[PDB]
Amino acid sequence: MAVIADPETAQGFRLAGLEGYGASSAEEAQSLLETLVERGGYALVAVDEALLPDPERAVERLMRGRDLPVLLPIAGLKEAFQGHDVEGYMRELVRKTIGFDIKL
Amino acid sequence: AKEAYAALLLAQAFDGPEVVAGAALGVPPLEGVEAEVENVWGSKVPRLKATFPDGALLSPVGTPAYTLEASRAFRRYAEALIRVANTETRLKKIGEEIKKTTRRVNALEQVV
């Protein structure tokens, strides 16, 4: 169940009792994500939003089927001070997802 | 997230980084999260929930006064994270199926 913002936060995840990591660069995070999809940490991964928003390139790299490693953006410890994007983030979710832009 | 972040800030600022290292690495990695199946409109996604055993009371007089508090904060954090993950995969399935039905309606109309 890997989660990648820092190794400093990841040892807090070990203090929670789940495996986590930290890379501080994009290809290193996708490579450790790649071996994590290869041999599982039971396939549920979150990556820091300032590190990788969409790691789905790794999904189409290794495991195009079953979408079992679910990939999540997550608010970092140096970023959770602001409350990242929530309403405009849903704006771009709708813009990405259905084609239309709405206001609601 | 802000709760667990402030809990770790207090538990490694008022305390030892070496002792949170020992308190983390003494705890095993705790595998055990599992999954079940949604079949709806034919489409099928697995949703997950975690076991997260609390039985590892490793010398249950916990030698710092704070990492039980921060550790349960991170356990609630991971519960909220797997909740957001299931919400995410449900919304992606609904979106791609609306994409399918939209190109199916447009194709069927304009072609046949």
Next chain:
Amino acid sequence: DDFAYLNARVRVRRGTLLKESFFQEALDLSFADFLRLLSETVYGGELAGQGLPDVDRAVLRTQAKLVGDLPRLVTGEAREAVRLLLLRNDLHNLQALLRAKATGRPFEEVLLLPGTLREEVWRQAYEAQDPAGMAQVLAVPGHPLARALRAVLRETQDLARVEALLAKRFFEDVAKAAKGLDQPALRDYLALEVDAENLRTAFKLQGSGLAPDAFFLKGGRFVDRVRFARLMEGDYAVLDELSGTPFSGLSGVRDLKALERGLRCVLLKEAKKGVQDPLGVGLVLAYVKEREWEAVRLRLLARRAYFGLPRAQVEEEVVC
């Protein structure tokens, strides 16, 4: 032996510290102004570069320089008395060695902070199949932790229940050694710390429904087994029953963070009363606790400037 020969250098070290106004000046910094303010401090004598890790290593090296010499420069009964001051990191390293012996992790797996003796003892105790032999290799003459390990050693070889009972017996042996010396103020501070630790572990394990007699230790003065059972039960009235004792502000609170902050403030006020004993060792323990609180505040300011934490979030820390 001499509680004045080391106390002269202890008063010299008490004259050389960073005030709380330096922390109030660190209340508005961005780790560069804070790094410059800490570079002027004694941790600036160990400040290698920048970052939270370099600052934490600098604070750890400054603490090991200030308090590691207190294990030296003394011999005999006062040496054992000063040995019964910095028992936190040594017992943490001993519990880490026990967890490594009962877990299977490698000898380099522990980060092995500065305890009370040389690290070659822990290196030889890494390859130690016999826990009684490991305690005998770790047996210093004034180390009561090895005595507690030998006392609880005739229960099992390496068990976690054995580790918890050995921690309780270590607190009990520390209380017996504090009673067994000619220092009533240090014994009173140790008894207050033991009672607050019993209240803390009971409030942390509150609601577990376990055996409180297995959890409550012997030696407390402000609370008894009935008071511990009433506090472990879902009632802050026992916490409201602490009237007149050092838990004065502790009344009607059921939390853990605020209760632990109040317990730390009460212990700091108790150690702040240690200025009355000039020719004893209470000034040394007061300086050790003050340096601990100051280094904790410095690491807190470092982490706050690292993650951009609020000053209102750290405002509950500047009172002590």
